[PDB]
Amino acid sequence: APQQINDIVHRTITPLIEQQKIPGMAVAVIYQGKPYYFTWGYADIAKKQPVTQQTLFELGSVSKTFTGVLGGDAIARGEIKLSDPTTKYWPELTAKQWNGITLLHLATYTAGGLPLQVPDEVKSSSDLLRFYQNWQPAWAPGTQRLYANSSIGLFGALAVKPSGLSFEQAMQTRVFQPLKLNHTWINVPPAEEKNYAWGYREGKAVHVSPGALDAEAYGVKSTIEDMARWVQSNLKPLDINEKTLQQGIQLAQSRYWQTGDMYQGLGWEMLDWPVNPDSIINGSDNKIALAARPVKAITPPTPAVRASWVHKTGATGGFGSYVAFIPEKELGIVMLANKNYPNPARVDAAWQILNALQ
Ligand SMILES: *[B]([O])([O])[C]([C]C1=[C]C(C([O])=O)=[C][C]=[C]1)[N]S(=O)(=O)[C]C1=[C][C]=[C][C]=[C]1
């Protein structure tokens, strides 16, 4: 890499790793459209396996960006509309609280207080139906945002129904394969297990457990190379040859709702660039990111704004990830770590790196 990229990355990430006691980390910077890679530490502490450019990390909620894009692609295919009632795709959802809840509300966490977590006891198709039928909204649709796996996770499951494909097969054939994300997985195959980092929680090696709507809300594992390619694809959707996918990427960066200085896309969240770093740094803290906040509808939604800080944090019990990019500057960053460390530390580091290069 150019020495400037080398220096800001190393000067930022070395201290981060030390302060946060991160066992292993991979970083990619995309600069004028080219990726530069950096790795530190261990994918598996016990077996002494280093982090490499091929190491798989659990993306946790950064998976929602793939879900939002796959949804976008289904809209572009004319398979679904965000204006469609949820019941169009799940007629068994007959409980009256569902009247007026659209796919848009599910995708953007505005259905009226769907919970952050699907309960552990929910597994089967019938368990899930029961859960949603019994759920009582605290608020009318399209009035408040509450970040929720049970919301965007349901969106992802319903979005692929017309296609006839399983969520995983839809994701592979419509997103992963076309973008050449050949080491990105919802289920890690046996052949790739040698590259699957362990996550670390309280010093213990852990992998994400199966759960309802896991694939849709937090299912994806990927390498730093594939995630850099994911960033490039979202930076320049027009370079993508598959028409509906190019369009789907654009739809996922549209601005649907505003709370404070942030706008809600499909999976992605966006702020105007230049961003106030305290606005995104403090904003990333779960204290704000996970809170109930009233939203203003953007009517109609603003198409992807190039002058944006577009980002998503993600975590599982053992991993912490962050992706941010600025389309107008052809600039972006991916940070993958096998410890779930605080969001504001992630955003602070990313801002320090991108600000310096911008
Ligand atoms: B995501 O990374 O924004 C999301 C947030 C979340 C946290 C928790 C929690 O604290 O238990 C529960 C649900 C959602 N994370 S996640 O979609 O990858 C789900 C998950 C969290 C922790 C461990 C495994 C899975």
Curated annotation (Swiss-Prot):
EC no. given is 3.5.2.6
Reaction(s) the record says it catalyses:
a beta-lactam + H2O = a substituted beta-amino acid
What result follows from mutating K64 to Q/T? Lowers activity more than 1000-fold and increases protein stability
Q: Which UniProt keywords apply?
A: Antibiotic resistance, Hydrolase, Periplasm, Signal
Q: What GO MF annotations does this protein's record show?
A: beta-lactamase activity
Provide GO CC annotations from the record: outer membrane-bounded periplasmic space
What is the induction note for this entry? Can be induced by beta-lactams. Expression is not up-regulated by the non-beta-lactam inhibitor, benzo(b)thiophene-2-boronic acid (BZBTH2B).
| UniProt-annotated catalytic positions | S61 (acyl-ester intermediate)
Result when mutating N286A: Reduces binding affinity of inhibitor compound 1 about 17-fold
Q: Name one Pfam family in it.
A: Beta-lactamase
> Where does this protein hold a beta-lactam?
S61, Q117, Y147, N149, A315, N340
PROSITE patterns according to UniProt: BETA_LACTAMASE_C
Q: Which domain of life is it from?
A: Bacteria
| Effect noted on mutating L116A | Reduces binding affinity of inhibitor compound 3 about 4-fold
InterPro entries, per this entry? Bact_CellWall_Synth/Modif, Beta-lactam-related, Beta-lactam/transpept-like, Beta-lactam_class-C_AS
Biological process annotations from GO: antibiotic catabolic process; response to antibiotic
Where is the chain membrane-spanning? none
Compartments where found: Periplasm
> Any other noteworthy remark?
The class C beta-lactamase family has a specific amino-acid numbering system known as SANC, for structural alignment-based numbering of class C beta-lactamases, or else the simpler name structural position. A multiple sequence alignment was used to derive a consensus sequence and then the consensus was numbered taking into account insertions and deletions. This allows use of identical numbers, e.g. for active site residues, despite differences in protein length.
Which PANTHER family is this protein grouped with? BETA-LACTAMASE-RELATED, D-ALANYL-D-ALANINE-CARBOXYPEPTIDASE/ENDOPEPTIDASE AMPH
Extract the NCBIfam families matched here.
bla_class_C, BlaEC, CMY2-MIR-ACT-EC
* Function comment: Class C beta-lactamase which confers resistance to penicillins and cephalosporins. Has benzylpenicillin- and cephaloridine-hydrolyzing activity. Has weak cefuroxime, cefotaxime, cefoxitin and oxacillin-hydrolyzing activities.
Annotated protein name in UniProt: Beta-lactamase
Q: Which organism is it from?
A: Escherichia coli (strain K12)
